[PDB]
């Protein structure tokens, strides 16, 4: 029922600025000065830092700025400061009393050197097809941030269940690594022409693929 | 200023449990604004009630919020495991302000004891190609989540490469994890067979799987 698209995530340094972004529709975000932005260090209670697009309340520093065009609204981060380290969410109303959610953006203060995720995909292996289970490994290792978003396809479909993804852990080389995996069922694996995951991390995309083999 | 929520609060399976959000005259006790928010660590929230008593949908019928004063209350009914999370209050005041409570825990008690799934995959095609043979051991399903691994290179221990993640809990509220072990194809196709061994509250688990004959 959201339109609220929020990138997933943003990174700098200290001293840098950040933008992020959340679009809606001309019902939603273009249809009045109604954002609003809100700041959640993980583990603790959200606290508003914008409303009605660019409204600092109280105790919001003006590094903080909020603005919008059509139907999207920016949240500008300037001078970035260790306390920044955050998820950022939107919301917007849109008709009917009815108020919209983004998905939130992890934002990462730089605390060590960017690394791409190293991208491994499993097909099933031949023990658990012989317990009727074909489920598909994406291993993901070697990153910072400790952001990833992951999706799969069967074929170029989206697929929209059996996915898991575990949270990303930092590991004994100081960098994260996560697992997705796509709890497929035997059929669907050997009836389609490939599965495919795709790592999202620091807004550029890897994708791997993997079909049926006979051995 | 916060709205005031206990830290925690506990039910078990099928029992209830009554959560409080204190504001003041200008916040909780000045209007209807008053909204409560699910939310599982490492998620994104859900918000569960809003205008005191009203869920959106898809909000099973089991919460339900009231407010007495300057004293919000959510029920959660029913209690299941899905419902162990962090619960926020929040409500709007004065001066376009909107006040957030510090959080209350809710904790299901008694979880049912799980013992781990394991699925020991060989190095990929694509991945050997690349000059690498890195084997994963993944690891579902389990409860609670405290999980230790051990590899074996043919029926020696494997001292060195294993990573394996913190367990994190998934969408059917059981931990899962990956142990990977980074091996050369030479290392690979030298032995016999490596082995993952998971071992959960004092069991353990064994697979093992060996260079592809095809
Ligand atoms: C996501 C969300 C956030 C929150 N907060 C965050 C602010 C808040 C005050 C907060 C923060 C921290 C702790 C406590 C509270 C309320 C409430 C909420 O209820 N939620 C879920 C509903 N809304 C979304 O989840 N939107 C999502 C993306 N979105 C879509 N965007 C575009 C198109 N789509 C098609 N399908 C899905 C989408 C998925």
């Known amino acids: 029922q959201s339109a609220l698209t929020q990138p997933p995530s943003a990174s700098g340094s200290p001293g840098q600025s950040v933008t992020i972004s959340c679009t809606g529709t001309?019902?939603?975000?273009?249809?009045?000065?109604?954002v609003s932005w809100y700041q959640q260090h993980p583990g603790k209670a959200p606290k508003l830092?914008?409303?009605?697009?660019?409204?600092?309340?109280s105790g919001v520093p003006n590094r903080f700025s909020g603005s919008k065009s059509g139907n999207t609204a920016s949240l500008t981060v300037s001078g970035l400061q260790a306390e920044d380290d955050a998820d950022?969410?939107?919301?917007?109303?849109?008709?009917?009393?009815?108020?919209?959610?983004?998905?939130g953006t992890k934002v990462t203060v730089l605390g060590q050197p960017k690394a791409a995720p190293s991208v491994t995909l499993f097909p099933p292996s031949s023990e658990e097809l012989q317990a009727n289970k074909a489920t598909l490994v994406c291993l993901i290792s070697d990153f910072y941030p400790g952001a990833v978003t992951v999706a799969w396809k069967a074929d170029s479909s989206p697929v929209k269940a059996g996915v898991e993804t575990t949270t990303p852990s930092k590991q004994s080389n100081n960098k994260y690594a996560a697992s997705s995996y796509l709890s497929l069922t035997p059929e669907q694996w050997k009836s389609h022409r490939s599965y495919s995951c795709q790592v999202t991390h620091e807004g550029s995309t890897v994708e791997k693929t993997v079909a049926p083999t006979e051995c | 200023s916060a709205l005031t929520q206990p830290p925690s609060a506990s039910g078990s399976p099928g029992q209830s449990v009554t959560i409080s959000c204190?504001?003041?005259?200008?916040?909780?006790?000045?209007?209807?604004?008053?909204?409560?928010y699910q939310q599982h660590p490492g998620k994104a929230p859900k918000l569960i009630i809003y205008?005191?008593?009203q869920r959106p949908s898809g909000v099973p019928n089991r919460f339900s919020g009231s407010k007495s004063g300057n004293t919000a209350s959510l029920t959660v009914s029913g209690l299941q495991a899905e419902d162990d999370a962090d619960?926020?209050?929040?409500?709007?005041?004065?001066?376009?302000?909107?006040?957030?409570?510090?959080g209350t825990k809710v904790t299901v008690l008694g979880q049912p004891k799980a013992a781990p799934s394991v699925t020991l995959f060989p190095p990929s095609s694509e991945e050997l190609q690349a000059n690498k043979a890195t084997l994963v051991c993944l690891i579902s399903d389990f409860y609670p989540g405290a999980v230790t691994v051990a590899w074996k290179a043919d029926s020696s221990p494997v001292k060195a490469g294993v990573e394996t993640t913190t367990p994190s809990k998934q969408s059917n509220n059981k931990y899962a994890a990956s142990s990977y072990l980074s091996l050369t194809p030479e290392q690979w196709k030298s032995h016999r067979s490596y082995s993952c061994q998971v071992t959960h509250e004092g069991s353990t688990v064994e697979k093992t799987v060996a260079p592809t004959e095809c």
């Open positions: 929040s409500s709007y005041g004065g001066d376009n302000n909107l006040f």
């Open positions: 001309s019902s939603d975000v273009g249809g009045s000065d109604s």
């Open positions: 919301s917007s109303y849109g008709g009917d009393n009815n108020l919209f």
């Open positions: 205008e005191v008593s």
